[PDB]
mmCIF file of C-alpha atoms in Angstrom:
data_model
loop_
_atom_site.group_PDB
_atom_site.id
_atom_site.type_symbol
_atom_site.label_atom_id
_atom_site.label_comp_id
_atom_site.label_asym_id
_atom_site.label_seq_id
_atom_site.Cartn_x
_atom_site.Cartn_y
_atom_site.Cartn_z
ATOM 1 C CA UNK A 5 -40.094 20.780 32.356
ATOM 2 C CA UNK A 6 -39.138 17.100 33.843
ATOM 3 C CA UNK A 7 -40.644 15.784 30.986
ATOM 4 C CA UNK A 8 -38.017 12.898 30.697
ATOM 5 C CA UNK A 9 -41.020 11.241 32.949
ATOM 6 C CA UNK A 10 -44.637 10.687 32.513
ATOM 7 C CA UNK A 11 -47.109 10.743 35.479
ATOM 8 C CA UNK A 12 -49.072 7.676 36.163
ATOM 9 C CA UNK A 13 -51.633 6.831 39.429
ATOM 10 C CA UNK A 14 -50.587 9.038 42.813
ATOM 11 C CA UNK A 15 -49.363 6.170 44.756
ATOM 12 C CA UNK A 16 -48.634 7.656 47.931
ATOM 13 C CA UNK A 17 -48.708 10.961 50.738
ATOM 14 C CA UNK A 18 -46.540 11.603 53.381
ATOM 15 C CA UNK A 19 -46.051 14.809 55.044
ATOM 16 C CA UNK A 20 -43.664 16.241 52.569
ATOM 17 C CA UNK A 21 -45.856 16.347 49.456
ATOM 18 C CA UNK A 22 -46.618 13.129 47.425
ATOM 19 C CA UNK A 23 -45.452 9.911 45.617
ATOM 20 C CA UNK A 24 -46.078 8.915 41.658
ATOM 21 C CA UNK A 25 -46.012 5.934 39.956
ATOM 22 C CA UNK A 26 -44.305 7.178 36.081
ATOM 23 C CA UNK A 27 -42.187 6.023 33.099
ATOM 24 C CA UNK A 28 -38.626 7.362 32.199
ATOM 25 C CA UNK A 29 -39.529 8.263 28.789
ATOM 26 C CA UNK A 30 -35.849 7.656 27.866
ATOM 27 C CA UNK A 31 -35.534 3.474 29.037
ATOM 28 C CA UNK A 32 -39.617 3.107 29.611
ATOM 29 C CA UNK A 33 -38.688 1.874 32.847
ATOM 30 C CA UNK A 34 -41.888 2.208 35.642
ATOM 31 C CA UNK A 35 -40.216 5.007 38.066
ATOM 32 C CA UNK A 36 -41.556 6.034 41.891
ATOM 33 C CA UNK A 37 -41.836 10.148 41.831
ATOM 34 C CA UNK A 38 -41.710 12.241 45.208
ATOM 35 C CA UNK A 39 -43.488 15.610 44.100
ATOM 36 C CA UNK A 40 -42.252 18.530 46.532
ATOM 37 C CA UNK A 41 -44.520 22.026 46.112
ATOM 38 C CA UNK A 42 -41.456 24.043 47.270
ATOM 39 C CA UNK A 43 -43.676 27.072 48.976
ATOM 40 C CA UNK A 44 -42.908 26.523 52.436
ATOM 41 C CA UNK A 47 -40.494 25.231 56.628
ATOM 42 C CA UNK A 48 -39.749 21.462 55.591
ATOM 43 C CA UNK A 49 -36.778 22.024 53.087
ATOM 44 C CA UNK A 50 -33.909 21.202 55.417
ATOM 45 C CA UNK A 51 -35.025 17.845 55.777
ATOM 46 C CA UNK A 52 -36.321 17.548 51.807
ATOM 47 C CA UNK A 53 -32.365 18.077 51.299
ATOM 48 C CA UNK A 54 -31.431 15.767 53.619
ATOM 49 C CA UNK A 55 -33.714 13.100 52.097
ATOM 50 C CA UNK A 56 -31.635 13.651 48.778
ATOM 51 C CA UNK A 57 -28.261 13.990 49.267
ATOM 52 C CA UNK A 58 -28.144 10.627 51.333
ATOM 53 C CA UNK A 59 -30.449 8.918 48.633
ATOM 54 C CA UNK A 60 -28.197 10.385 46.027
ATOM 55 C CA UNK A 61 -24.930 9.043 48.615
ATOM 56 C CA UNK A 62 -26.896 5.391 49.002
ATOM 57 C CA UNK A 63 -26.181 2.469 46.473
ATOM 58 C CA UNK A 64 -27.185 -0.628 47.547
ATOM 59 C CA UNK A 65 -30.160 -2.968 46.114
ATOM 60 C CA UNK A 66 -32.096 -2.526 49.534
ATOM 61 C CA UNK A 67 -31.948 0.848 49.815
ATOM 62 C CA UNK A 68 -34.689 2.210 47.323
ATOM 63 C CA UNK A 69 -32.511 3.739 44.391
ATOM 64 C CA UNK A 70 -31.982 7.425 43.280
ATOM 65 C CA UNK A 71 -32.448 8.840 39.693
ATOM 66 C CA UNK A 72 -32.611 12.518 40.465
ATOM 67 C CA UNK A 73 -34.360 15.707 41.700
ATOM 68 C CA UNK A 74 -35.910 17.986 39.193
ATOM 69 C CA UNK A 75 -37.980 21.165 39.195
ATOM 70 C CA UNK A 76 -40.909 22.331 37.458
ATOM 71 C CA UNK A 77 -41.653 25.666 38.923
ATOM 72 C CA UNK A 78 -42.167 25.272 42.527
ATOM 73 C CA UNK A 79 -42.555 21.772 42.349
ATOM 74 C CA UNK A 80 -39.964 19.587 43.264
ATOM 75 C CA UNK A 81 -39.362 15.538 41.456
ATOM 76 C CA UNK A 82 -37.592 13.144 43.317
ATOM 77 C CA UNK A 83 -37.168 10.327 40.882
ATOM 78 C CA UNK A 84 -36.484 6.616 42.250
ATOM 79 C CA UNK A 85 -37.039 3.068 42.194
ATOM 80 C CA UNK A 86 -40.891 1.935 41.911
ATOM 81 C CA UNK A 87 -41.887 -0.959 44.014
ATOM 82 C CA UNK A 88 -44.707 -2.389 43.017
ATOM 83 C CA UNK A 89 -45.617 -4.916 46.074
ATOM 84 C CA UNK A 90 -45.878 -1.565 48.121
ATOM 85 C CA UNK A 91 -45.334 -1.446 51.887
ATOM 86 C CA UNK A 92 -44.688 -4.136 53.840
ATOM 87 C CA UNK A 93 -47.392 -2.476 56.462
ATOM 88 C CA UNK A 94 -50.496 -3.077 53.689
ATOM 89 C CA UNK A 95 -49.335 -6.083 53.203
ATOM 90 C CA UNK A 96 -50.372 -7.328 56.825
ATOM 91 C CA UNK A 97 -53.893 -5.927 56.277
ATOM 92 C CA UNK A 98 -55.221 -9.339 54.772
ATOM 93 C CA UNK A 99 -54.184 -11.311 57.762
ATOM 94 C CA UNK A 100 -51.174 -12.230 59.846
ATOM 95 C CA UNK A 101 -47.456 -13.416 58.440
ATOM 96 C CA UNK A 102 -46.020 -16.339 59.022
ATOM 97 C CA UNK A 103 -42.594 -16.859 60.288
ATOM 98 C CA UNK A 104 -41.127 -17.509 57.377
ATOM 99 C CA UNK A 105 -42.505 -14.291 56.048
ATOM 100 C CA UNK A 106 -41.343 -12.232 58.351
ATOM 101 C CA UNK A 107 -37.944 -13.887 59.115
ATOM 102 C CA UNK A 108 -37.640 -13.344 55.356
ATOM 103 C CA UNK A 109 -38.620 -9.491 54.855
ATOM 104 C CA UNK A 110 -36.441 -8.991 58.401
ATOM 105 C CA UNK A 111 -33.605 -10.213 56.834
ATOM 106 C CA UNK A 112 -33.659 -7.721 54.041
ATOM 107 C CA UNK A 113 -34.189 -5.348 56.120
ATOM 108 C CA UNK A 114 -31.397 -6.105 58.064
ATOM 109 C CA UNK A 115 -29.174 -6.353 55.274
ATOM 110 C CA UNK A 116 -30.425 -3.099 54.190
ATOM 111 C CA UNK A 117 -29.716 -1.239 57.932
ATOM 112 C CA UNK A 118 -26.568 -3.031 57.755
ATOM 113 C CA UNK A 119 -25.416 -1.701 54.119
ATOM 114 C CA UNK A 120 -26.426 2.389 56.136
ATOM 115 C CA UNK A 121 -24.821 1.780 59.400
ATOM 116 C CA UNK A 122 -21.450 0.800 57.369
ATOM 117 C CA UNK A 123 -22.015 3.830 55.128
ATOM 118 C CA UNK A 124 -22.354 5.389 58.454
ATOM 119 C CA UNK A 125 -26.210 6.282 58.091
ATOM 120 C CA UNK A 126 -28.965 6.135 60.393
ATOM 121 C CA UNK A 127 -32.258 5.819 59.073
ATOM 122 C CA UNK A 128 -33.971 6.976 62.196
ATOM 123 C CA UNK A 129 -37.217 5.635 61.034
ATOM 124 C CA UNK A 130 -38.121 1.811 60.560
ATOM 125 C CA UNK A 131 -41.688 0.842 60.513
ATOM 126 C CA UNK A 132 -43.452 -1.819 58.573
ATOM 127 C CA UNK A 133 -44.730 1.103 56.479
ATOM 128 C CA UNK A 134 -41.125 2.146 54.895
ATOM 129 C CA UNK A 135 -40.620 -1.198 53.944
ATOM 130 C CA UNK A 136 -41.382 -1.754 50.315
ATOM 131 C CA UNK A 137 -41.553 -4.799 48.314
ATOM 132 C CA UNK A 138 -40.811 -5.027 44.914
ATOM 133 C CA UNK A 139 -43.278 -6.949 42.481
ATOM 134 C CA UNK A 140 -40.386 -9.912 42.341
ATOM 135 C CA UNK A 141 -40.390 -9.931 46.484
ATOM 136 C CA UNK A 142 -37.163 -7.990 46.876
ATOM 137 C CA UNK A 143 -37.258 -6.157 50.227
ATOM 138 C CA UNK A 144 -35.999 -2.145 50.138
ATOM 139 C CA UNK A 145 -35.938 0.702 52.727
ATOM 140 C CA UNK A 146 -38.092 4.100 51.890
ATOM 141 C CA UNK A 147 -38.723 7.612 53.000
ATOM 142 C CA UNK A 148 -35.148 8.867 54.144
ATOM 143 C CA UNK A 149 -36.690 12.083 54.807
ATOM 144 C CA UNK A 150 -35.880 12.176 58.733
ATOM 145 C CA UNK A 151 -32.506 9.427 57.805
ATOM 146 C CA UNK A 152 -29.211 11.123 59.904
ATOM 147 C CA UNK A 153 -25.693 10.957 59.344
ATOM 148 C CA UNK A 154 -22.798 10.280 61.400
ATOM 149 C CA UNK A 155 -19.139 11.336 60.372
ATOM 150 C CA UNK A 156 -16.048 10.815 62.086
ATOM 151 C CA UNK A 157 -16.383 13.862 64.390
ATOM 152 C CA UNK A 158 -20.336 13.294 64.687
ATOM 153 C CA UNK A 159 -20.124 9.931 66.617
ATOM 154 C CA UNK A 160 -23.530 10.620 67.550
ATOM 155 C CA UNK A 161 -26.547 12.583 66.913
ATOM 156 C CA UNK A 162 -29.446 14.209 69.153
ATOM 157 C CA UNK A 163 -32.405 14.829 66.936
ATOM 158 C CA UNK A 164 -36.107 14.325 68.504
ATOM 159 C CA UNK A 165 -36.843 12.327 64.988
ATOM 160 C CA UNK A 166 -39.026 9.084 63.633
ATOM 161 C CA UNK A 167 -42.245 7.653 64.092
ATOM 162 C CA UNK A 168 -43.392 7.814 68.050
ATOM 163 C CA UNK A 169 -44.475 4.163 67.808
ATOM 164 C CA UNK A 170 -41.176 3.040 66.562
ATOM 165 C CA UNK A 171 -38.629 5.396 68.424
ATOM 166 C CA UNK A 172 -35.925 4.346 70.397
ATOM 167 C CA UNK A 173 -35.920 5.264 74.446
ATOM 168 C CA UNK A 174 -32.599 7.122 73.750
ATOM 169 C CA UNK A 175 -34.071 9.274 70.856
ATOM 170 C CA UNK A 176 -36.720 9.847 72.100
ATOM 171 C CA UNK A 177 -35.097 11.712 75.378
ATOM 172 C CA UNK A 178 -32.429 13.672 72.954
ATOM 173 C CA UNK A 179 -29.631 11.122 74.692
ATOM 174 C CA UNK A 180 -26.488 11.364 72.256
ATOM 175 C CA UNK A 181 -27.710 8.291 69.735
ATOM 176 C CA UNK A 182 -26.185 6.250 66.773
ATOM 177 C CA UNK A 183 -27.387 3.215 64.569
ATOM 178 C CA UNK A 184 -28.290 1.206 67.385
ATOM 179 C CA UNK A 185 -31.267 2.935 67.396
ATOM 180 C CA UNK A 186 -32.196 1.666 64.173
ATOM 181 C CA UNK A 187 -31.862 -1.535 66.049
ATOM 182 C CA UNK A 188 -34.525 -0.626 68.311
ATOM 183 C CA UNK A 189 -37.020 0.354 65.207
ATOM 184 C CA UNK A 190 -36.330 -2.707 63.955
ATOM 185 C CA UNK A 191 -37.135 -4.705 67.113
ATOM 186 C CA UNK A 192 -40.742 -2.874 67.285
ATOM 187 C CA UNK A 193 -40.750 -3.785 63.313
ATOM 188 C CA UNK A 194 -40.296 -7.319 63.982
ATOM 189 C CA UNK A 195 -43.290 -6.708 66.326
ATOM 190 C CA UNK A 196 -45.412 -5.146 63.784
ATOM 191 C CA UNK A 197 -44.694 -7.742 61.599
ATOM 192 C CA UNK A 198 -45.718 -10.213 63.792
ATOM 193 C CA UNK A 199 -48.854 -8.895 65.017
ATOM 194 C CA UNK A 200 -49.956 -6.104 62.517
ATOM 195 C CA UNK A 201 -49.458 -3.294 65.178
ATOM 196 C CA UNK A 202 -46.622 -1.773 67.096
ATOM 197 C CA UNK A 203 -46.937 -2.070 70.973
ATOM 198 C CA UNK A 204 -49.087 0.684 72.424
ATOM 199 C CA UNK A 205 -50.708 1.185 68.798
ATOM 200 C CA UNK A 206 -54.265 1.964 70.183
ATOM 201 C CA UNK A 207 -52.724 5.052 72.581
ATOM 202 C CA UNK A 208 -51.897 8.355 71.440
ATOM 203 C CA UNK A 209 -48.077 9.070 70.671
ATOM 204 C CA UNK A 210 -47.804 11.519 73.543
ATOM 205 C CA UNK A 211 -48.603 9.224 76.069
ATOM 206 C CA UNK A 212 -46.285 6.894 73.994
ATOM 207 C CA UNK A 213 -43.616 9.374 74.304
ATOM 208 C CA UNK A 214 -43.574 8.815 77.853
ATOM 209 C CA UNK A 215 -43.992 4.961 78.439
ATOM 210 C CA UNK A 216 -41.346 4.465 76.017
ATOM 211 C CA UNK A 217 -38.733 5.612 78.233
ATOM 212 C CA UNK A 218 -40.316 4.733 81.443
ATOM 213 C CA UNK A 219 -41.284 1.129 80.712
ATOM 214 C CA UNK A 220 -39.030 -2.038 80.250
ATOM 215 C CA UNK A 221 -38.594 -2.911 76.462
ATOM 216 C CA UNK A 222 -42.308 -4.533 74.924
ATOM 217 C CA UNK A 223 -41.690 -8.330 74.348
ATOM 218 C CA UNK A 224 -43.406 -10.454 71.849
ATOM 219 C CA UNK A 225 -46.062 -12.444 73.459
ATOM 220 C CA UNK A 226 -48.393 -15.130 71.666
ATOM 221 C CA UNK A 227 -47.852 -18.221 70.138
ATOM 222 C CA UNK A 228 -44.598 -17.478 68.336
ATOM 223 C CA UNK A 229 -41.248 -19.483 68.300
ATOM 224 C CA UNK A 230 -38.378 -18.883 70.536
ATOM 225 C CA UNK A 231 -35.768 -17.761 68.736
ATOM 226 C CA UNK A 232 -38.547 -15.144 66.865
ATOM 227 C CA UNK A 233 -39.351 -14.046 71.054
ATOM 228 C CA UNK A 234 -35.513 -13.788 71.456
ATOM 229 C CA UNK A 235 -34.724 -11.481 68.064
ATOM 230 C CA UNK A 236 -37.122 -9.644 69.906
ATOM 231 C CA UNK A 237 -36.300 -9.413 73.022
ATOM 232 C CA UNK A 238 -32.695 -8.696 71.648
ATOM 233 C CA UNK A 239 -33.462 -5.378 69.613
ATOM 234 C CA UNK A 240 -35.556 -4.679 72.140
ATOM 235 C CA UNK A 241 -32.945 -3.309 75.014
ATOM 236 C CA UNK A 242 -33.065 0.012 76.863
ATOM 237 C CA UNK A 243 -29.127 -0.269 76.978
ATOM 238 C CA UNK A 244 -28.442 0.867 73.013
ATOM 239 C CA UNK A 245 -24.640 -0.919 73.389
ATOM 240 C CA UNK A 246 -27.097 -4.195 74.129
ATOM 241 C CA UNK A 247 -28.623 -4.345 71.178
ATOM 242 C CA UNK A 248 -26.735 -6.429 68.617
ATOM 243 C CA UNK A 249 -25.238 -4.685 65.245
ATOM 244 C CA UNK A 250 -27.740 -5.187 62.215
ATOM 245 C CA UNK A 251 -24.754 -7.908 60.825
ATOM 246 C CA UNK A 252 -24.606 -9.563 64.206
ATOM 247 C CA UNK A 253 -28.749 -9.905 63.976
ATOM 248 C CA UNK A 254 -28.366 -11.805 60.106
ATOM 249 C CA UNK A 255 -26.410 -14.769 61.680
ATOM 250 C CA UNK A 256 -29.273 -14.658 64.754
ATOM 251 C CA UNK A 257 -31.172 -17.949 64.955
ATOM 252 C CA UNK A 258 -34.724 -17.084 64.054
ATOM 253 C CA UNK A 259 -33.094 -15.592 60.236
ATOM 254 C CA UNK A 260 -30.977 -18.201 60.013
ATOM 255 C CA UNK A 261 -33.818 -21.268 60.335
ATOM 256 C CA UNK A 262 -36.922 -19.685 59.111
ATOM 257 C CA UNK A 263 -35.815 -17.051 56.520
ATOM 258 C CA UNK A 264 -36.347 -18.974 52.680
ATOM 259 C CA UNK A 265 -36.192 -17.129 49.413
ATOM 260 C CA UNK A 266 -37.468 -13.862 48.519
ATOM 261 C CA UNK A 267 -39.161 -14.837 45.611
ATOM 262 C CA UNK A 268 -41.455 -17.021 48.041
ATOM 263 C CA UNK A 269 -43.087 -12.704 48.693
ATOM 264 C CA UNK A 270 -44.621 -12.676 45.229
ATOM 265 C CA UNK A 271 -47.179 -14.758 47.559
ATOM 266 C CA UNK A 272 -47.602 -12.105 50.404
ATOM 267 C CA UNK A 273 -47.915 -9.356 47.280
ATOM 268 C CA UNK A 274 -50.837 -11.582 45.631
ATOM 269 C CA UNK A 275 -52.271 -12.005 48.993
ATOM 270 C CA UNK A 276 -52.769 -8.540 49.311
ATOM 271 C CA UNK A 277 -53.713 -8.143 45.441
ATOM 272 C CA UNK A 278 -56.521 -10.744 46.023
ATOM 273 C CA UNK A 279 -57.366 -9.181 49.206
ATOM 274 C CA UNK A 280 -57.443 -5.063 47.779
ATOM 275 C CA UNK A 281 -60.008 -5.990 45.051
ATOM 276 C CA UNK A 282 -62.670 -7.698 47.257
ATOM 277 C CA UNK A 283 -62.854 -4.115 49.087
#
């Protein structure tokens, strides 16, 4: 079968199946492997997740090897990344601004690299954010990801994490990157704090105060300029919100954002952290 790779430790579930650590047997190179059981509903947006990995080249965008299939089971082969998400990182204890100035910026360089390639993700939490073992920052999980062409200006999918979601997406309203912008807002958040705004609620009731509230703001004992990224993702008006480019030269980046080899300390944090139970 796919026997160019080795299974290691399950490192992962989503809905779609689950995630692999495993070896190219070819280069010996550690490998992150999406297993698909293709017997049923989903498969529309298991395509989707691999023909825009498969269109995506940029080193924070997680990279794409191939698909394979054994049977019924489907392996998607990409880049491992071995400091995991950016979500069990926080576990331990809070960031620092630094920190998350830092893995923002990759991330924004990251949104930045899709929204040129005309690509939304359509689905930025702290959680599809992976780090690898180094500190480099990369996106994940493109399952839901959307694409705009130059007749599709916009899309209207009901798609991403509730928590997360944009008002516009939420309501169907004709959307584009900006909403990425959004995510990314409620991901500094997260970052911040270790919990999206309305976190303890259920996403229904989410799904509603979303749209009907003002944007969540940042509140505690954190810098301007971090309040004011916020608070400037954060818009209901999606034309508002500034372009991921536009948010790299923003203040907060700009003054607290160091190396990204200064992560290999969040990732031993966690390390530390994961074997004391």
């Amino acid at each position: 079968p796919e026997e160019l790779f080795t299974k290691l430790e399950k490192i992962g579930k989503g809905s779609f199946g689950e995630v692999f650590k495993g070896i190219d047997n070819r280069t010996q190179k550690v490998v992150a492997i999406k297993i698909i059981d293709l017997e049923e509903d989903e498969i529309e947006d298991i395509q989707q997740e691999i023909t825009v990995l498969s269109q995506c080249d940029s080193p924070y965008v997680t990279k794409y090897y191939g698909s394979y299939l054994k049977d019924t089971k489907l392996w998607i082969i990409m880049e491992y990344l071995g400091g995991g998400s950016a979500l069990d990182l926080l576990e331990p204890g809070p960031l620092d601004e630094t920190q998350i100035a830092t893995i923002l910026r990759e991330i924004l360089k990251g949104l930045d690299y899709l929204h040129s390639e005309k690509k939304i993700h359509r689905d930025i939490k702290a959680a599809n954010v992976l780090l690898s073992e180094h500190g480099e920052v990369k996106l994940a999980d493109f399952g839901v990801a959307g694409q705009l062409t130059d007749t599709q200006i916009k899309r209207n999918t009901f798609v991403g994490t509730p928590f997360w979601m944009a008002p516009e997406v939420i309501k169907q309203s004709a959307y584009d990157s900006k909403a990425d912008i959004w995510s990314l807002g409620i991901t500094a958040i997260e970052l911040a704090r270790g919990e999206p705004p309305h976190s303890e609620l259920h996403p229904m009731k989410v799904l509603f105060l979303i749209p009907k509230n003002n944007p969540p703001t940042l509140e505690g004992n954190y810098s301007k300029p971090l309040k004011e990224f916020v608070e400037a993702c954060l818009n209901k008006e999606p034309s508002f919100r500034p372009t991921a480019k536009e948010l790299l030269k923003h203040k907060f980046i700009l003054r607290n954002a160091k190396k990204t080899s200064y992560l290999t300390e969040l990732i031993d944090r966690y390390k530390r952290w994961k074997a004391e139970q």
